[PDB]
Amino acid sequence: GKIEEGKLVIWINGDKGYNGLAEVGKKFEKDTGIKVTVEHPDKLEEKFPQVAATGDGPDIIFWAHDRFGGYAQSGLLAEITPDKAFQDKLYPFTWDAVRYNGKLIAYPIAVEALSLIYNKDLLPNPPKTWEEIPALDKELKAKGKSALMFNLQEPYFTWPLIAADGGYAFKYKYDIKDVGVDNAGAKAGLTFLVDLIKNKHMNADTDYSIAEAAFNKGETAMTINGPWAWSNIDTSKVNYGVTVLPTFKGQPSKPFVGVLSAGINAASPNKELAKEFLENYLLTDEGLEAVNKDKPLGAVALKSYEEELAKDPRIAATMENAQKGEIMPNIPQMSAFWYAVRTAVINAASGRQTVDEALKDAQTGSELYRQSLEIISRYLREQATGAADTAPMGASGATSRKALETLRRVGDGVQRNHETAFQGMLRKLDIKNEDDVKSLSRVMIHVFSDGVTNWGRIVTLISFGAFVAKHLKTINQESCIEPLAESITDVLVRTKRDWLVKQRGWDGFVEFFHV
Ligand SMILES: Cc1c(C(=O)O)n2c3ccc(Cl)c(c13)-c1c(nn(C)c1C)CSCc1cc(n(C)n1)CCc1cc(c3ccc(F)cc3c1)OCCC2
Ligand SMILES: OC[C@H]1O[C@H](O[C@H]2[C@H](O)[C@@H](O)[C@@H](O)O[C@@H]2CO)[C@H](O)[C@@H](O)[C@@H]1O
Known part of the structure; x- marks a missing residue:
């Protein structure tokens, strides 16, 4: 449940130089008396968000930068504030890879490309x-x-x-x-x-x-x-x-293109020890050398050590491929995009699906969060204010528009028919401000994840959201509606991802409630 004070636990992938990293850990222990434990668990990039959400996990997590925006959005990472002298030792584009909502969320280590x-x-x-x-x-x-x-x-x-x-x-x-x-x-x-x-x-x-x-x-x-x-x-x-x-x-x-990066767990009581380790032991010529000698890093982020390694034709090739590629986004959707495409490639390769079928499902899976949020946010806001959003729906707009129209019909019916249960539960929850809205996620997941899966229960989830949004607006807490919509969307897509893709997402919804 709680991370131990006075030591460092580090997670890094089993394909990287974890023995070299442990050698840097031993150097740290020799200076400080603080023991550093390096582990390489299977699926650490999936385990980290689960364990860190409970206040547990490693002090420091190493992964490519693409996963870190999700972790930061979930509140799982400490903000990194190195001084100018330190920041100037690394290439600016590597700091850009670890910036999320204008805050540095990890230390960049090295640039990776196939x-x-x-x-x-x-x-x-x-x-x-x-x-x-x-x-x-x-x-x-x-x-x-x-x-x-x-x-x-x-x-x-x-x-x-x-x-x-x-x-x-x-x-x-x-x-x-x-x-x-x-x-x-x-x-x-x-x-x-x-x-x-x-x-x-x-x-x-x-x-x-x-x-x-x-x-x-x-x-x-x-x-x-x-x-x-x-x-x-x-x-x-x-x-x-x-x-x-x-x-x-x-x-x-x-x-x-990936930037191997080191984030500090928001729940760590060892944030100062972690910063000291990362800035003054790891991100030094000698620290990176110890790791690079075990398994090569790529083009390191540290200007001084990267200058020495840059004459290596293998690194030159890595950077040529990198220049032809693209830096990964760090947006929270990246995890879903990778899951969707992983499944598409495996199924197309095995013959489980045709290429057309496989990529259609991957497109639906990748679009699911954003399309779901568009529909839910618009329903909650128009319910609260009485007036619709005039902005264009954008991509897959016919589906969004028709899903919103369907939801107006069925959602308004649910709010009428379940006025008694909704009013009762609204009063018991005593939702007053953005802090109360943030507390809803855990209880919503509990209730909604239990029992059968169907479109009717999805309507109940969203319709009670609208019921709450109406309440929020009335008490001058209209600013809480967008966070509410984001929270509901997250519950929906995380809990019902595979089912939703199987229904053809929101087109399934529209067809289910046709007439
Ligand atoms: C049956 C029912 C379901 C379902 O089939 O899953 N859902 C409901 C949503 C609201 C209501 Cl009032 C009921 C349901 C309800 C109840 N009786 N009847 C007759 C109904 C129709 C109370 S029993 C179920 C319950 C609700 C809560 N708890 C602790 N338990 C409060 C925690 C909470 C839960 C939410 C929220 C969604 C949006 C939001 F802004 C805040 C939310 C807060 O959604 C849960 C999933 C949707
Ligand atoms: O296959 C999807 C996977 O791609 C990347 O993971 C890479 C990682 O960046 C490399 O350092 C190396 O470990 O190989 C991994 C592929 O097995 C993304 O970083 C990752 O989030 C994504 O799931």
């Missing part, structure tokens, strides 16, 4: 194009080898191909309502991947460990991986090169 890694003894020159890989595989199969193996279980690895011909996550300012997962470009890329599998150039079951072992044993000519993998390749004594990813339809593969 590259094409190839065995010079099998393929002296790497392929410039994806399109030439089937013919290379045919050549290599006659030598008892194969052209390419990489992790097909994590969408981070397949994304560069999906993005190449025009797939995108959130259109870039970001337009969060503009998602590019089921467009022609995304379909072309994923169809190419699925055709590789159909034609027996790759196996849908290949994962990180299987691809790594095949490459490092000299069984496959190429893999796709990041700087952290280079240690194990060095140990293997494969004659490898690191290069630009192949093009698709003449266009570069576009890796999603």
